[PDB]
Amino acid sequence: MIIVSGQLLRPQNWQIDQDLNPLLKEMIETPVQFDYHSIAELMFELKLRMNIVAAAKTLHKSGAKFATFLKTYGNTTYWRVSPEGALELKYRMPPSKAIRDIAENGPFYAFECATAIVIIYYLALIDTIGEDKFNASFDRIILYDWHYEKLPIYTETGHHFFLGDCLYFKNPEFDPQKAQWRGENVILLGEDKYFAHGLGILNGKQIIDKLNSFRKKGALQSAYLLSQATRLDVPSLFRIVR
Amino acid sequence: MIIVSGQLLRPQNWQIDQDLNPLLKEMIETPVQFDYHSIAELMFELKLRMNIVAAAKTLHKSGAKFATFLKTYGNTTYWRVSPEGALELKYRMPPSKAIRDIAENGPFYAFECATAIVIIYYLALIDTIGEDKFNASFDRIILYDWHYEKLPIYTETGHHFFLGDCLYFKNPEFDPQKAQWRGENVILLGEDKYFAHGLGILNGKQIIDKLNSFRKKGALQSAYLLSQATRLDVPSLFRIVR
Ligand SMILES: [Zn+2]
């Protein structure tokens, strides 16, 4: 359910990009309320969301590898690794160029799943607003777990998902001796289609089977898709960027 | 105006902390709309907002000082300082205790205004959800500018402000040779009463006059209060407690 200013946007035709139509159909037909001050905001969400999907695929194909925090590394041209495994942007290096380098020189990098989701958000935003505005607004950067610089991010409870969402497969009786499998952060790329850093581009059955192979002795509870989604707040981004 | 699950809340008696009565009345009487899924959720916001105020006051009195990023330092028991000026929680230090140390050992710290706001949000959260939930959720921490570990923070346009809001006095024609005076991030403690890391607890005139003293030659644009507020997203957070 899309609302602009105050008008319910019914199927009212538009000269917009094809790869945006599937998402827009979802957003119009769902009972979920999407409120925007203007059409420009709506279009920003559509492009931003599909750029999240495209960025996930870019990262997937980059050659960037999975590593635990203590085994994290990155291109020293742009990033310093802290003792704890944080990727610190080096003094006065331009954020856009440093973050794009993850996509362009993937083999020089390895990091965790959460850090990968944040990288993806930044790449998508860069694709959406351009290097200059990104660099003006998100001017200091450390990539580490769920750290983000200024991004307005929220998590809501419920069953309705949209392209570009960040979802989570939980593994409740995971093997305590292998905490790396307590669950999996993913980008929703398409229907039953997910990017999961370290696993690849997979469907839900595959992700669930994988987690279930790393449970404790006697575990009966299967891994499952949590009913929640993690999302960028588009109206707030308009304040933060333009 | 407060609405829970679809029902307006007018004066209805309640057995709640007196400290919360003012803010609640203010939130019922305002034309802005606060929506919740439960009474618990509303109570969480009241406590969180009042703990933001208390946390600002605590940082004010702690002895922690203002410093630039390149001059930022912290208690090396818990924090390392990156070359760029990020305070990084050391490997396996308990997050709640390390963050609380900023209040209990203030003279061992100095950091800038955005970092100060984020610290205040963590301190307030610890007081609102408790150490166990905090450490479970916010298990890795780097304090640096507007970096957040998982915090759901948004900025909205408007001119109705409430206790605990984070506001911004902009100095549009700041002296370029004194870039720290581009503006001041503040927490609203009461009517025309603000905490400003580095200035203390000031009224709006005092902040503006101070900013105005650091402008370019002949500037005719006064520093002024922006019509926006930065806020923690309660339903995103409240997920943690229930
Ligand atoms: Zn050390």
From Swiss-Prot, chains A, B:
Protein EC: 2.3.2.13
MF GO annotations: protein-glutamine gamma-glutamyltransferase activity
Source organism superkingdom: Bacteria
InterPro entries: Gln_gamma-glutamylTfrase_bac (IPR020916)
Role this protein plays: Probably plays a role in the assembly of the spore coat proteins by catalyzing epsilon-(gamma-glutamyl)lysine cross-links. In wild-type spores at 37 degrees Celsius, tgl mediates the cross-linking of GerQ in higher molecular mass forms, probably in cooperation with YabG.
Disruption phenotype: In cells missing this gene some GerQ multimers are present, indicating that tgl is not essential. Heat treatment for 20 minutes at 60 degrees Celsius, which maximally activates the Tgl enzymatic activity, causes cross-linking of GerQ in isolated yabG-deleted spores but not in tgl/yabG double-mutant spores. Additionally, the germination frequency of the tgl/yabG double-mutant spores in the presence of L-alanine with or without heat activation at 60 degrees Celsius is lower than that of wild-type spores.
Catalysis: reaction(s): L-glutaminyl-[protein] + L-lysyl-[protein] = [protein]-L-lysyl-N(6)-5-L-glutamyl-[protein] + NH4(+)
Family indicated by similarity: Belongs to the bacillus TGase family.
Keyword rRNA processing set for record: no
Claim: Iron-sulfur is one of the keywords in the record: no
Record's protein name: Protein-glutamine gamma-glutamyltransferase
NCBIfam families (alphabetical): PRK03187.1
Record-level GO BP terms: sporulation resulting in formation of a cellular spore
Keywords of the record: Acyltransferase, Sporulation, Transferase
